[PDB]
Write a protein that binds this ligand. Sequence first.
Ligand SMILES: CNC(=O)c1c[nH]c2ccc(N3CCCc4cc(-c5cnn(C)c5)c(C(F)F)cc43)cc12
Ligand code: NA
Length: 115
Amino acid sequence: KIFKPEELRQALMPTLEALYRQDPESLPFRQPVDPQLLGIPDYFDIVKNPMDLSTIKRKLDTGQYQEPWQYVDDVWLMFNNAWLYNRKTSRVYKFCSKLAEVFEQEIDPVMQSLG
Ligand SMILES: CNC(=O)c1c[nH]c2ccc(N3CCCc4cc(-c5cnn(C)c5)c(C(F)F)cc43)cc12
Ligand code: NA
């Protein structure tokens, strides 16, 4: 069970695109959180391992995932950082929940088809 890079990209890139297509919900997630620009300096205290869609896309494009679960792990790290940091009434928190619902539905048949 060795996965070729283009096998992972062809299967998994569409699931990432489905997250980017969510508007407005993907908007806080398209680039790394920049705490200084956003006025949230406490972010680097609370979020030890940042992740976002641009980083995941670059890792798929450059062959940094060897197995599918490593990609799923990074998507879930992005979601967990956002639920950890943001208040339950906030846009980014509610938007994260939508992205998780979309991702759950996208990734399920994809994982089957990868073996
Ligand atoms: C994973 N993100 C976090 O953990 C963030 C925690 N604090 C934040 C404050 C602002 C933003 N950013 C980033 C830059 C783009 C952006 C765009 C929107 C947006 C939503 N809709 N529109 C029309 C624009 C929002 C907004 F949801 F707050 C937030 C943000 C992200 C976060
Ligand atoms: Na699709």
